[PDB]
Ligand binder design. Structure first.
Ligand SMILES: [Cl-]
Ligand SMILES: [Cl-]
Ligand SMILES: [Cl-]
Ligand SMILES: [Cl-]
Ligand SMILES: [Cl-]
Ligand code: NA
Length: 129
């Protein structure tokens, strides 16, 4: 499912990301735009053979099981495929674990490079929230 910006900001807010670990909603919406284009089915394969999955591009090296990242973990204890659903619940629950891991939103490279330090509230202006 490909969300629009405000649709996804609403959903995200509804699953409790606004100010989660101190990260205001716009951080999350920014991250998702640049990670996945707001597409829940996005998948990308990394150089180590792991893969990133879903609207927040969560990686199999550590967070989910895909059966083809040898040596890896499944800390979210989910198939990676659950991160591809039209319902964002499993991606959000897993994103909450990740952001609580030590490095905050720096886990998301696109966040660091494109969202961190910017006026992220732009991303939720004009949304019904
Ligand atoms: Cl947009
Ligand atoms: Cl595996
Ligand atoms: Cl959803
Ligand atoms: Cl932090
Ligand atoms: Cl914000
Ligand atoms: Na894994």
């Amino acid at each position: 499912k490909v969300f629009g910006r405000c649709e996804l900001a609403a959903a995200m807010k509804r699953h409790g990301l606004d100010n989660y670990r101190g990260y205001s909603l716009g951080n999350w919406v920014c991250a998702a735009k640049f990670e996945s284009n707001f597409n829940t089915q996005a998948t990308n394969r990394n150089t180590d053979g792991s893969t990133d999955y879903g609207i927040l591009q969560i990686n199999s090296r550590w967070w989910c099981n895909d059966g083809r990242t040898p040596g890896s973990r499944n800390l979210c204890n989910i198939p990676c495929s659950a991160l591809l659903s039209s319902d964002i619940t499993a991606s959000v629950n897993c994103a909450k674990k990740i952001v609580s891991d030590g490095n905050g939103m720096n886990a998301w490279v696109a966040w660091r490079n494109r969202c961190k330090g910017t006026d992220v509230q732009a991303w939720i202006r004009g949304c019904r929230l």
